Ligand SMILES: *[C@@H]1O[C@H](CO)[C@@H](O)[C@H](O[C@@H]2OC[C@@H](O)[C@H](O)[C@H]2O)[C@H]1O
Ligand SMILES: *[C@@H]1O[C@H](CO)[C@@H](O)[C@H](O)[C@H]1O
Ligand SMILES: *[C@@H]1O[C@@H](C)[C@@H](O)[C@@H](O)[C@@H]1O
Ligand SMILES: *[C@@H]1O[C@@H](C)[C@@H](O)[C@@H](O)[C@@H]1O
Ligand SMILES: *[C@@H]1O[C@@H](C)[C@@H](O)[C@@H](O)[C@@H]1O
Ligand SMILES: *[C@@H]1O[C@@H](C)[C@@H](O)[C@@H](O)[C@@H]1O
Ligand SMILES: [Ca+2]
Ligand SMILES: [Ca+2]
Ligand SMILES: [Ca+2]
């Protein structure tokens with residue numbers, strides 16, 4: 247009878263009946279002739295805007311980065327415990343599988359944990375001594391100089407060391423006084439013919 251026409255598709259098995267037939271489907275198929283591939287994606291199993299891809303008796307999810315895992319329930323977050331130290335900025339890679347760190351001044355290494363020794367190419371000026379520190383440095387100035395890199399010749403004329411209105415000229419750790427009429431001495435402290 248009716249199974250002679252080989253009606254079942256998708257590998258189903260036909261059984262003859264009174265005035266018809268039944269197809270027993272392989273797992274994953276349904277319909278009178280097993281023509282339907284059951285849509286296991288109908289339950290919307292993929293999270294986080296992943297795409298469900300139907301299979302025979304199953305599905306998978308293609309996740310949208312940075313989500314991953316069987317149902318897009320995991321997230322790639324290489325910057326989550328901020329591996330960049332000492333103020334460094336964490337940047338996630340394009341594919342979210344790795345990170346990089348932009349280090350602050352003074353720091354280097356993959357995670358910004360290695361000091362830079364500024365004294366190797368010392369920025370200190372005017373004979374100052376360079377002291378390297380962890381994440382910085384310090385210049386120790388010679389007499390007469392100030393500033394971060396001991397680059398400033400100190401203004402020895404402020405406050406004015408010249409008494410009695412004398413004019414001050416700055417030098418290296420020194421000041422020179424030109425006295426007003428009536429005054430003399432290194433700092434104009436001596437009066438002559440006054441009152
Ligand atoms: C509908 O969504 C369910 C999760 O909320 C998911 O489990 C169903 O998938 C079944 O799980 C096992 C797998 O082998 C079967 O094919 C599938 O039907 C999903 O269809
Ligand atoms: C022969 O097969 C067809 C389907 O292709 C079915 O309609 C008939 O009943 C069967 O005998
Ligand atoms: C008949 O039943 C179906 C479900 C498949 O297992 C076939 O291979 C078999 O012949
Ligand atoms: C299915 O694939 C995932 C990765 C996302 O791109 C969705 O937009 C798409 O439908
Ligand atoms: C390095 O050390 C500092 C403190 C100054 O004394 C410099 O003259 C010296 O070379
Ligand atoms: C400095 O020189 C003294 C002697 C005065 O003439 C001042 O006014 C000047 O600034
Ligand atoms: Ca029959
Ligand atoms: Ca299916
Ligand atoms: Ca340093």
Ligand SMILES: [Ca+2]
Nearest residue numbers: 400402417419
């Ligand atoms: Ca000076």
